[PDB]
């Protein structure tokens, strides 16, 4: 399987409308070598996907959001699953590849009573402490603190890419305009301006938060090359017996 194989089938896999959902497993199968993917916990916490695959013959760990289940929102079980998988991959020098399409965390009283904060911190810690090479691709959405939890550039990420349909923002347009334009009573133009100049990856690109805006059909060829140069990554951290994960 050539490392520069194009994947034109991913050019239109993301629907134009944000309400319609797609299967992230299709993208994962298209990107990896020979379309072979070993999924871990495929029937538990289905809003997130973790597994092992190969890129140019090298073992890689894959973490991704599943928009089909619960619109891709993060919850307690998915957070724990992804956190432990990421910790295992980091502990044994396995590179991590992340596909990000998340609108935030699942709301509700049950999640708050169950300690969603602790498990979200678990996942954020797992992505933050990883010293193995990590490559992140944003497909459609990355909203709020979840965008930080999903291996952003600012967590010592190595390479971050955004598809032309990516949307990196603090929150949705309606909440942002209702919290900013409290009494402007001019929502008709506020919606247009906000969706024109924020509902796109440009604010993240101009600040350098994403390395490039790439065509989906070149995703695989973009990742493999990165894995060629990040194989010798070495970082230094302060000494400690062990840290205190929020378990």
């Amino acid at each position: 399987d050539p490392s520069d194989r194009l994947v034109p089938e991913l050019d239109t896999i993301v629907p134009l409308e944000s309400t319609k959902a797609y299967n992230m497993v299709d993208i994962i199968h298209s990107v990896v070598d020979e379309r072979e993917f070993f999924e871990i916990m495929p029937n538990y916490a289905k809003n997130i996907i973790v597994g092992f695959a190969r890129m140019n013959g090298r073992t890689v760990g894959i973490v991704g959001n599943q928009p089909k289940v619960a619109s891709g929102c993060l919850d307690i079980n998915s957070s724990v699953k992804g956190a432990r998988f990421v910790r295992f991959c980091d502990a044994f020098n396995i590179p991590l590849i992340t596909f990000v399409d998340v609108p935030g965390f699942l709301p509700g009283t049950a999640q708050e009573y169950g300690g969603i904060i602790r498990h979200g911190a678990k996942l954020l810690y797992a992505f933050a402490e990883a010293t193995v090479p990590k490559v992140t691709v944003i497909t459609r959405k990355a909203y709020g603190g979840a965008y930080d939890v999903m291996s952003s550039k600012h967590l010592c990420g190595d390479t971050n890419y955004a598809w032309p349909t990516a949307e990196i923002a603090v929150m949705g347009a309606k909440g942002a305009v209702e919290i900013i334009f409290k009494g402007h009573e001019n929502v008709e133009a506020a919606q247009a301006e906000y969706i024109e100049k924020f509902a796109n990856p440009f604010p993240a690109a101009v600040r350098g938060f994403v390395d490039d805006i790439i065509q989906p059909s070149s995703t695989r060829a973009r990742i493999c090359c990165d894995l060629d140069v990040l194989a010798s990554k070495k970082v230094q951290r302060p000494w400690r017996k062990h840290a205190n994960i929020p378990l």
Partner: peptide, 11 residues
């Protein structure tokens, strides 16, 4: 997060 800041608050 300060909404007016934008992605700066997330960073």
């Amino acid at each position: 997060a300060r909404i007016q800041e934008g992605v700066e608050s997330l960073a």
